[PDB]
Amino acid sequence: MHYTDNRYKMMECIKDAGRPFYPHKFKISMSLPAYALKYGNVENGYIDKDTTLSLSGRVTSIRSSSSKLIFYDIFCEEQKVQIIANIMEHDISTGEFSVSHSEIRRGDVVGFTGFPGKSKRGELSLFSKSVVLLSPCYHMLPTAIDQEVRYRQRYLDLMLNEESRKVFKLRSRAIKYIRNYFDRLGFLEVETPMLNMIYGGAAARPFITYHNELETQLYMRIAPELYLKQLIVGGLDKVYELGKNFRNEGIDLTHNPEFTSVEFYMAYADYYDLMDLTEELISGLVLEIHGSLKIPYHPDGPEGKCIEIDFTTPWKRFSFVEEIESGLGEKLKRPLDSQENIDFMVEMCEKHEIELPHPRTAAKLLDKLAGHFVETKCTNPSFIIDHPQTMSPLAKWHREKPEMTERFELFVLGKELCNAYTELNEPLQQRKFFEQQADAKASGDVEACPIDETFCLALEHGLPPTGGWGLGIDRLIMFLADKNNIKEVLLFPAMR
Amino acid sequence: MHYTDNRYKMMECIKDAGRPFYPHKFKISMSLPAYALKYGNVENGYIDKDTTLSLSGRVTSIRSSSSKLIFYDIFCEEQKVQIIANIMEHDISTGEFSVSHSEIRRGDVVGFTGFPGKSKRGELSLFSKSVVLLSPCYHMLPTAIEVRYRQRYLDLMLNEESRKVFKLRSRAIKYIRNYFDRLGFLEVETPMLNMIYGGAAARPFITYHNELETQLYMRIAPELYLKQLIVGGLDKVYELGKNFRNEGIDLTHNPEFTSVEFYMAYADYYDLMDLTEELISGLVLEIHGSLKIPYHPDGPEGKCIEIDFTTPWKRFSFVEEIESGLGEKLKRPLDSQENIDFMVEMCEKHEIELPHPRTAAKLLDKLAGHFVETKCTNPSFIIDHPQTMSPLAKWHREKPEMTERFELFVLGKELCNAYTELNEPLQQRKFFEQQADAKASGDVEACPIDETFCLALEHGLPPTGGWGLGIDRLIMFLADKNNIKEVLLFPAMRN
Ligand SMILES: Cc1nc(N)c2c(F)c(F)c(NC3CCCC3)c(F)c2n1
Ligand SMILES: Cc1nc(N)c2c(F)c(F)c(NC3CCCC3)c(F)c2n1
Ligand SMILES: N[C@@H](CCCC[NH3+])C(=O)O
Ligand SMILES: N[C@@H](CCCC[NH3+])C(=O)O
C-alpha cells in the first residue's frame, strides 16, 4: 500500500523537479535478442568504446556493488542483458549519477545508452553512460509465480513465467499451421456473422442480445455451419472459417464461454474422406511440434503422472450404438426414438448410476449413455461414429445403417476435439428434423435450436454432396502444450 | 409457380421407384479446371473412347436438340464444360435415356460419366454415357442477377464479380497478417465478452451469462486487453477479428466488422504513420499495380474518380483546420464551458447538427466532421486531436491540450485510429473519470471506468504505439464498392 503511494509521490516529485517524466519516445539501437546475437560470443572483458548503443527493457535486478558502480539486469523479448553503470562513464548532462540512479526501482521500464561488450566474468553487458526512467512500476513485484492472480492479472504471469509465454507462441504456431493446411489445399478463408437473428449448428445454449435500431434480438453464434453450407450452395466448393464461437453455459477445465474453432465445408467429400483428412491434419501438427506421434501428457498437472498419447494413424473407430450395447450387455430398443427406448434408457441410467439429462429426450439419453460407455474408452485419438439421426439433425442418413447418420466425433482422453459429418442436403428431411429440434427446445432442451427457414430455402437451391467438420483448437492446444486446464491456453479466460 | 411443389413431387416419385435419390458420394475423376487443362487443346472432334471419366457440376444450360441428343453445360470451380448426351451411348442399366434425362433441370447439381474430347465445333466436351442427379434445384433460377444480400448463394452462383470480391478480401487479410508476422508480431486473441466494455467511442451490445450470473458486453475494441499484453512483455502483438456496435447501419457501418489492432512497444505515433503508409500503399500496389486506383463514390452508375495513395500522405492538424474553416479561433481551454458555448454557436452558424449531450469532445467531433474530414479525398491523416476527445492517447509532447493521435481518412471515411499510448496512470484514471461523467450526463458512446486496466498501467506500460484499421472499409476501396453490403458475405439487413 505504502510502496504504491510512495512511488506516486516520488513520480510527482520528479515531475515537479523538471526531471524526465514519462518520455514519449526512446529510440533503441536494436532489440535485446539482436544485441545478444551480435555480442553474445565476444571475449570476456571485451568492450567496444567506439560504438554507442541504446537499449531498453524491464529491470529485473538492481545491485549497487560500490559507491561507484551499479549493476542492473534488464529483460525484453525473452533476453536478459546486464547493465554496468560506472560513475566515471556517467553523462553529467543527464544529471548527477546518484540522482539519475536513485529514481530507478526493480520492475521499472528503463532505457540505457552505452558501449557494448562482456564483463570480465563473462556476462553479456552494456557499459552505460546514461539511464532514462520510461515507465515506473508502482508495485513490489513477486519474484516468481491465490493463484487466480495468474488469470485475473495475466500481465504478471507473462512478466514472470517463461512457460506461460511459450504457450501463447505455440498457440499462434498451431493456428498458422492450420490456416496453411487449408490454404494450400485451395480452401477459401471466409468470415460469417457472429450475430445471428436465428442461432443454429450446434448443441448449445446461446448468448442473447438486442439491436436497438434494427429492433430485433440477435444471438451470438454457436457455430458458423449454416452460413458455411450456403457458400457451398453458392459454388465456392471449399471454404473454411477459423474464429470464435460462444456458449452461454458453465465453465470447467475444458469449457470456456468463448473458444476458437475451425470449420470447413468441402464439396464432394463424405465422412470417410473427413476421417482421413482429420488424421492427416492432426498427426501432421503433432509431428511438427513434437517430432513424433507419441507425446507426453500430464492429466493431473505437472506434479502428477506422465502418460503417453499415441497419434499413430489410423485411429480406432467405435460405433456409437454397438459400443453402448456392449456396455449394457443388451440391445437398445428400436426405433431408438420410441417411447419404449426412452423408458429403457431411463431404466438403464438408474441401473448404471448415470445422471439423467433434462428433458429426457431420446437424443439426450443416448448422449449420456455414450458419455458413460463409449467416451470413457477414448484414451488415444478415437473416432466415435455413426450417431443416431435423432441426436444429429444436420447429418445425412447413413447409407447402410438404419436410423444412423454419417457422423463422427474425435475424442482424445475422453475430450471432444472434432465433430463432422456427410452433410444433410435433402430439404424435406432437414425441415422435419428442424421441427423436431424446435419441439425439443419448446419442451425445455436448452441445447436444441429453432427452425431456420433461410437455411431450408438455401437447401432448396441444391447443396452438392458435401462433407463438413469442426475442430476445437483450444482443446487441441491443451494436448499439444501439455496443459490440463483451459485457463492455461487462453490469455484472458473466464473466471467465476 | 407450382415449380417448387412439383419438384418435391418429382423427387418423391424417384425415391419411391428406387431410383437414385440424393447419392451420398460421387467420386470425380478430376476437377473441371483439371479437365480443361488436360483436354482443352485436343483437336476438334477428338474423342478418347478408351478413357471413361466422372465429372460433376451445376447445370447452367440444357438444350434437348432432338429426341436422341441433349446438350448440357455444367459449371464448377470457375470452369464450364459441355456434356453431349447421345442416346446411342447411354447405359441402359441406369434407366431408359428419356427417363434418366427427364429428371434433370437447369440448376441441378449432377454427375456424368463418359469419354473426353471436343465437339466438331471445337467445344471442350464430355460424351456422356450416364447422368446422376446429385442435388436438385427446386427453384427456377434467373439467368443472371436485395436478393443478392439476403440470398448470397444466388449471387455467388450467378455472379463471377461477387466471387472475385470475396477472394480479394481473403488476399487482403492474408497480406495483412503476413505484414505483421514478418515484423515479428505475435498474433493473439483477447475476449469478445467483456465484464466492462471500453476502448472506443461506441454503444455496445449487452448480454447475460446465466451460469455465472453476470451481465456481459460484446467488445467494441480489444485495446485495453492488448495493452495489458505489452505490460506483460510480449512487445509486439496484433489481433485481427470482429468488433461490435449496437448502432445504426449505413453504407459504411455494419453491427459487426473486422478490424486489426496492433500494439508495438517503443513506437510513437510518427512511427505508426510511417507503418500505415507502408502497409496500405504496399497492399494497394499488390492488388492494383499502381498507387492510383479507381473509385465509384455513388455506385457503378455514377462517376469514377481516382484515389492517389502516393506517399507522403497529407497531414491535417485537427484544431488548426477547424479554425481555418471557421475563420476564427476556438476558445481556450478547449474543454471550458466558454468554448463549449462557442462551439454550439459555431454549429448553429454553419448549420452543423448538434451532438447530444453537448460535451466539448462531441462538439469538436462535429466540427472536424464538417470542416476537416470533408477535405480528405486521397488518404489523409488528421492529427493531434484534443485530449478531451482522446482519453487513451498520450499528451502531445509539444502542443498544449492535444494528444499524439491520428485518424486516417479516405474519401471522408475513417480507416484508422492510432496514438502514442497513454502510459501514465494518474492521468489515465482522471480521463476515465471524465468518460464515466460523460456517460452519466447522457453520452451513450462514453465508456465506464475499468479499474483492472488502471491497475495494469500501475505495473508499467512501456512507451508504446497502438493502432487499428477497419479492414472492411479498406476492402471497399480496394474492390471499388460504395456499400459495405458488397464486401460482407452476410451483411445485416432490415427486417
Ligand atoms: C475451450 C472450449 N470451450 C467450449 N465451451 C467448447 C465447446 F462447447 C465445444 F462444443 C467444443 N467443441 C468442438 C468440437 C467441434 C467444434 C469445437 C469445444 F472445443 C469447446 N472448447
Ligand atoms: C464496416 C464497419 N462498421 C462499423 N460499424 C465500423 C465502426 F463502427 C468503426 F468504428 C470503424 N472504425 C475503424 C477505425 C479503427 C477501428 C476500425 C469501422 F471501420 C467500422 N467498419
Ligand atoms: N457445427 C459443429 C461442427 C461441424 C459439424 C459438421 N457440419 C459443432 O459445432 O459441433
Ligand atoms: N481502439 C481504437 C483503435 C486503436 C487506437 C489506438 N490505441 C478504435 O476502436 O478506434
Numbering used by the authors:
A (entry chain A): 45 to 189, 194 to 544
B (entry chain B): 45 to 189, 196 to 545
The authors write:
Aminoacyl-tRNA synthetases (aaRS), ubiquitous enzymes that are essential for protein translation, are considered attractive therapeutic targets in a number of infectious diseases, including malaria, tuberculosis and cryptosporidiosis. KRS1-mediated synthesis of lysyl tRNA occurs in two distinct steps. In the first step, lysine and ATP are combined to form a lysyl-5′-AMP intermediate with the concomitant release of pyrophosphate. In the second step of the reaction, the lysyl-5′-AMP intermediate is conjugated to the 3′ of the cognate tRNA.
Given that the ATP-binding pockets of the KRS1 enzymes of T. cruzi and C. parvum only differ by four amino acids, we synthesized a T. cruzi/C. parvum hybrid enzyme (TcCpKRS1) by mutating the four variable amino acids in the CpKRS1 enzyme to the corresponding T. cruzi residues (I290L, A309S, M310V and I538L). This hybrid enzyme readily crystallized in the presence of lysine, with the resulting crystals then soaked in the presence of DMU371 or DMU759. TcCpKRS crystals soaked with DMU759 did not produce a liganded structure, however, those soaked with DMU371 diffracted to 1.6Å revealing TcCpKRS bound to inhibitor. DMU371 was bound within the ATP-binding pocket of the enzyme, with the quinazoline ring of the inhibitor in space usually occupied by the adenine ring of ATP, forming π-π stacking interactions with F307 (equivalent to F317 in TcKRS1) and R523 (equivalent to R536 in TcKRS1). The cyclopentyl moiety of DMU371 occupies a position similar to that adopted by the furan ring of ATP, in a pocket created by the lysine substrate S309 (equivalent to S319 in TcKRS1) and surrounding amino acids and lined by three water molecules. Based on our TcCpKRS1 liganded structure, mutation of S309 to leucine is likely to hinder the binding of DMU371 in a relatively minor way. In contrast, this mutation would likely cause a greater clash with the larger cyclohexyl group of DMU759, explaining the enhanced resistance seen with this analog compared to DMU371. As expected, both DMU371 and DMU759 proved to be potent inhibitors of TcKRS1 activity in this assay with mean IC50 values of 185 nM (95% confidence interval, 98–352 nM, n=7) and 15 nM (95% confidence interval, 5–43 nM, n=4), respectively. Future studies will focus on further developing the series to increase metabolic stability whilst retaining potency facilitated by our high-resolution liganded structure. This structure revealed a number of pockets close to the current inhibitor binding site that could be exploited to improve ligand binding. H-bond interactions formed by the amino-quinazoline are well characterized thanks to our protein-ligand structure confirming the pyrimidine ring portion of this series will be difficult to replace, but this can be balanced by exploration of other 6,6 ring systems.
